């Protein structure tokens, strides 16, 4: 991967309005529907269930698990079958010692079962920009959410982000450096969430001790439904174990930084979830194919004020199989059972907190963890990026004039080239020394076969067809051509067709800028230059397109006209 460091460039970006998070968001949501559409649909499973609590000694054990027998269809239409299964408490509701139970989504939305073969494991994916566009990467260790980044570089595609859906704790994220970051759109406004990034990872161990089994009961021709079978072994709760020394130590890093915004000596308490659906209230995360829901009350009961066993923390976690990711209406997914005992071990790299508010000020401050939206899981990683389009047609005045109408070498070792867009922070004279660097990259791959060279392998997009990224690539390769040919068409009317630098006869008006040639070319970057001339750049493009190069054509041939 080629990453270029820009010298003397102070480009700032706003994390909250960053357009890269919403594109991924709509990208994952579109990706999910493209995977569940080909899978089998459990429309016949919405049938009155007759459930009997699973074999357990009631000491209170208040098992959520049920054992329900239902009249299910089979391969033949006239025939039926009475089969049983197991369902947690969260998946079934009572319909007014076995009683009648109903699947939770039957009254609201249809349900469809995720294919057993597809894996929900997050893999790193990098997002790049199309040919003719650039991505600016902040390299400031102490970088705030919004503001100038003193050290900026550029890269084609971002380092891959593992898309991990996490409600209360960010999982397997990028570690911060030195002090932990407290990024917020407005720390004073409670409505905006408080995103945190850890510098030291907190390991977490989650398990489902119940040794379930998978039972495939054919329910349609070519269609098979997967239900939980007999549970082997002790009935136990799903739990997550986090070491208290490390969590107490990290929690001490977050509380120290928070005092900078609210004062040195103030009450900083941590509290529990204050309400919401089962998603927001618990640490909803996926592991091994199932979806845990952990009460985090043991992590977030503490009180800090001013200054001054070695056993782990255990979390009771519920498990649900019927879920509507991202609060979508009219849709539901049934995750198939996972045979055997499963273990989870991940790293905690960030939290999503909330301001409590209230009328009292400077008396007490409590932070309540929450997971209102999944977009905040993407802002925790796309914070250091920004998308920009490069514009290569910059005009400037110079005493050089057009070759008279009546009229008709160093070979290498140019020094200290800066790479693509490396001269963006250098002077206009120094930046004008490297023009083929950008002109190479305006079209096709910026580096190492970046895009067009890649789309050459066969059956990559043919098999892909229009699914997912297949339409993303056509819009990225067609827009690249349309922007390149736009500048060439601008030259075709302006003269200078094969020339990177052309001077044509057009007078530079003094009202556009009162600065002299020296001061402009001595110590100015082309970026600052495009700002002042931005008000007049359209007019220059109108005088230069015809009066400069079409008056010549009308005169140039008249000159040779009979």
């Amino acid at each position, epitope marked *: 991967p080629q990453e270029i460091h820009l010298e003397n460039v102070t480009e700032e970006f706003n994390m909250w309005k960053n357009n890269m998070v919403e594109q991924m968001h709509t990208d994952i949501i579109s990706l999910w529907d493209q995977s569940l559409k080909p899978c089998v649909k459990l429309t016949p499973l919405c049938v009155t269930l007759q459930c009997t609590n699973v074999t357990n000694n009631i000491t209170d054990m208040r098992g959520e698990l049920k054992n329900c027998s239902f009249n299910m269809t089979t391969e033949l239409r006239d025939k039926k079958q009475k089969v049983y299964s197991l369902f947690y408490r969260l998946d079934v509701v009572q319909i007014n010692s076995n009683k009648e139970y109903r699947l939770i989504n039957c009254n609201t939305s249809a349900i469809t079962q995720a294919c057993p073969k597809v894996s929900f494991e997050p893999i790193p994916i990098h997002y790049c920009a199309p040919a003719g566009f650039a991505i600016l990467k902040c390299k400031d260790k102490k970088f705030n959410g919004t503001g100038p980044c003193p050290s900026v570089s550029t890269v084609q595609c971002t380092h891959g982000i593992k898309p991990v859906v996490s409600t209360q704790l960010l999982l397997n994220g990028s570690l911060a450096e030195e002090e932990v970051m407290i990024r917020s759109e407005n720390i*004073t406004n409670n409505a905006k969430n408080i995103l945190v990034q850890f510098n030291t990872p907190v390991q977490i161990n989650c398990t489902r001790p119940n040794n379930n089994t998978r039972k495939s009961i054919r329910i349609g021709p070519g269609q098979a439904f997967y239900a939980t079978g007999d549970i082997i072994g002790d009935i136990r709760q799903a739990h997550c174990n986090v070491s208290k020394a490390t969590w107490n130590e990290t929690l001490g890093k977050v509380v120290k930084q928070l005092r900078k915004h609210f004062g040195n000596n103030t009450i900083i308490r941590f509290a529990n979830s204050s309400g*919401g659906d089962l998603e927001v209230t618990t640490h909803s995360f996926n592991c091994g194919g199932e979806f845990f829901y952990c009460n985090t009350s043991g992590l977030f009961n503490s009180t800090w004020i001013s200054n001054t066993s070695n056993d782990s923390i255990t979390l009771p976690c519920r498990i649900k199989q019927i879920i509507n990711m991202w609060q979508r209406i009219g849709q539901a997914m049934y995750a198939p059972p996972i045979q055997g005992v499963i273990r989870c071990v991940s790293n905690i790299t960030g939290l999503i907190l909330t301001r409590d508010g209230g009328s009292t*000020n400077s008396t007490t401050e409590t932070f309540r963890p929450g997971g209102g939206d999944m977009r905040d899981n993407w802002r925790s990683e796309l914070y250091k990026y920004k998308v920009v389009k490069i514009e290569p047609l910059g005009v400037a005045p110079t005493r050089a004039k057009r070759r008279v109408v009546g009229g008709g070498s160093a070979v290498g070792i140019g020094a200290v080239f800066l790479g693509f867009l490396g001269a963006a922070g250098s002077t206009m004279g120094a930046a004008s020394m490297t023009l083929t660097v950008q002109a190479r990259n305006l079209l096709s791959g910026i580096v190492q076969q970046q895009s067009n060279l890649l789309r050459a392998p066969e059956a990559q997009q043919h098999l892909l067809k229009l699914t997912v990224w297949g339409i993303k690539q056509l819009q990225a390769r067609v827009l690249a051509v349309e922007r390149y040919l736009r500048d060439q068409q601008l030259l075709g009317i302006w003269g200078c067709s094969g020339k990177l630098i052309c001077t044509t006869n057009v007078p530079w008006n003094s009202s556009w800028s009162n600065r002299n040639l020296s001061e402009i070319w001595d110590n100015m970057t082309w970026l600052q230059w495009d700002k002042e001339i931005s008000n007049y750049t359209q007019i220059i493009y109108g005088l230069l397109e015809e009066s400069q190069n079409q008056q010549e054509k009308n005169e140039q041939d008249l000159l040779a006209l009979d």
Partner: antibody
Framework: EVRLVQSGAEVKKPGASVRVSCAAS????????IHWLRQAPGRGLEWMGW????????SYARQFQGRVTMTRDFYIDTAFMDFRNLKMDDTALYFC?????????????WGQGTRVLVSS | SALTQPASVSGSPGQSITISCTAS????????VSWYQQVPGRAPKLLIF???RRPSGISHRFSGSKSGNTASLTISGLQIEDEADYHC?????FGGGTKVFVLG
């Protein structure tokens, strides 16, 4: 054509734990957070809590912790507010409002209000 | 009331009168204010959401600016329709209301 519709006036003895409904119409309900504000006759407006439709997240004021609880339902585009253990001091008009499109702490749309009086 | 508002204001029709919004010495990040025109006993009406920006349905006569820790609202060409209860809010904090009186 966006307007919030509240519940009707109700009277209750202390400890009665009244709930109020706020109906949303004319816009995508699942986008903006809903706020509950109460105004006494001899006092200014007071902010009680905000709850957003996606995920039900809710933040409650310090003095209303353990006393109030807010939820919502996407199918009926309505946010509810459960105010348990009501007191004689808490009698006033209850408004539910939505923040403006500018996303700053401003309220562009309101409701007709509900009258809640506690007495013996 | 984390902030405070003037108890009563009085002025002749057509005269410009200003309203203030106090700030505590411990206020943090006081960067936005929205004013409201609440009919006594009815739903409030948003006069300006941001410090200076105004909605469409609100007249041009209503204006507002912030200097230091004080927010100011000025009315020009006062009419009786304008008489109501006014409130300035910063984040969740509100004010006790500003009584208005039209003379005579």
């Amino acid at each position: 054509e966006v307007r919030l519709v509240q519940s009707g006036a109700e009277v209750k003895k202390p400890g009665a734990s009244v709930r109020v409904s706020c109906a949303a119409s004319g816009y995508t309900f699942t986008d903006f957070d809903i706020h509950w504000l109460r105004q006494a006759p001899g006092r200014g407006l007071e902010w009680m809590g905000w709850v957003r439709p996606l995920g039900g997240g809710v933040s409650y004021a310090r003095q209303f912790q353990g006393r109030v609880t807010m939820t919502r339902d996407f199918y009926i585009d309505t946010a509810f507010m459960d105010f348990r253990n009501l007191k004689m001091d808490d009698t006033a008009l209850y408004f539910c409002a939505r923040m403006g499109a500018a996303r700053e702490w401003d309220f562009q749309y309101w409701g007709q209000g509900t009258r809640v009086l506690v007495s013996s | 009331s984390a902030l405070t508002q003037p108890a009563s204001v009085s002025g002749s029709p057509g005269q410009s009168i200003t309203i203030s919004c106090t700030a505590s010495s411990d206020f943090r990040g006081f960067s936005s204010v929205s004013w409201y025109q609440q009919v006594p006993g009815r739903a409030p009406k948003l006069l300006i959401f941001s410090v200076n920006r105004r909605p469409s349905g609100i007249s041009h006569r209503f204006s507002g600016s912030k200097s230091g820790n004080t927010a100011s609202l000025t009315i020009s060409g006062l009419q009786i329709e304008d008489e109501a209860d006014y409130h300035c809010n910063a984040y969740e904090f509100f004010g006790g209301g500003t009584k208005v009186f039209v003379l005579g």
